Amino acid sequence: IVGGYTCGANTVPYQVSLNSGYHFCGGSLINSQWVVSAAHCYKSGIQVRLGEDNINVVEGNEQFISASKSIVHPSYNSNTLNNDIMLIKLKSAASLNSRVASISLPTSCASAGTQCLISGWGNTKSSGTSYPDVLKCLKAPILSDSSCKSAYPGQITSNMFCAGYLEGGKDSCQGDSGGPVVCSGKLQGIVSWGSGCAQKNKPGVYTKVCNYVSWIKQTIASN
Ligand SMILES: NC(=[NH2+])c1ccc2nc(C(=O)c3nc4ccc(C(N)=[NH2+])cc4[nH]3)[nH]c2c1
Ligand SMILES: [Ca+2]
Ligand SMILES: [Mg+2]
Ligand SMILES: [Zn+2]
Structure with missing residues (x-):
């Protein structure tokens, strides 16, 4: 930014960091088991980190959950970026609280x-x-x-x-x-x-x- x-x-509180050994994209939590992000952020081996503020320090409010499945929009075009959206399902539901919300x-x-x-x-x-x-x-x-x-x-x-x-x-x-x-x-x-x-x-x-x-x-x- x-x-x-x-x-x-x-x-x-709905901001998520997608991590594959490092932070590479953001996402939004839409309910305890699902995240919406961009299709051009697709990668295999994603861990979703919720409740983050400093992404290099565990400050106490984080939840790190692996993705069980990713679904890139059926009509995503990587050359024009038309329909650039993807859904990520979490392996475990996240616990919603003040710091983690959808x-x-x-x-x-x-x-x-x-x-x-x-x-x-x-x-x-x-x-x-x-x-x-x-x-x-x-x-x-x-x-x-x-x-x-x-x-x-x-x-x-x-x-x-x-x-x-x-x-x-x-x-x-x-x-x-x-x-x-x-x-x-x-x-x-x-x-x-x-x-x-x-x-x-x-x-x-x-x-x-x-x-x-x-x-x-x-x-x-x-x-
Ligand atoms: N508002 C803007 N000006 C903007 C926003 C996002 C952008 N993203 C790129 C980009 O150029 C870009 N976003 C990437 C995300 C992942 C990978 C990757 N290698 N996995 C490569 C990428 N390149 N330009 C961008 C410009
Ligand atoms: Ca942190
Ligand atoms: Mg972001
Ligand atoms: Zn990008």
Whole structure:
């Protein structure tokens, strides 16, 4: 997250860190047994870490649970990143408490202008590399699809939306991938891609979760 602030320990209780010997992507807990992340974060051998703040220090509120199954969207296209979403089932249900909680799926899509909260442990430098150990947060609004499409001609589909600032300075980045974009208490996006991080007229692009609620519900109830 570039140009953001330290969230505060466990102030984003649905944020998950996906680990394969190191943190490589974020995710969101949707219920005690399931996590939604991005399909471009797919890997075999994932351990989900809940209740994290510093990912290098066991501070006492963590739960490390291995994934039993991953399901990448049936129509995910790794070249265009269209339908960039994946579900991960936990081997054991997590214990929900103040520090570990799930986030609600949306009942409708959000409007351009809505302010959201994006979080993660990804890179914090636009022109450089600095990976933080504690969770960073960023408040950013959903942008109009026209400013999104003018920034990425022929690359945006109906399953994507842009959020951020066109002036640059604030954006999600590598390492934030798969993490949450929450607006009005609902998970509306998943960190997916962008051009570099925090560059002018290159906002971040997010998977439009309101388009996959039926697929999510149907898939977790049958697995
Ligand atoms: N398993 C891997 N090797 C891997 C995993 C995630 C990656 N992600 C990128 C990436 O290139 C990438 N992930 C991004 C997320 C947000 C933004 C943004 N500017 N908002 C830009 C991003 N670029 N390469 C990746 C490689
Ligand atoms: Ca920790
Ligand atoms: Mg994240
Ligand atoms: Zn990524």
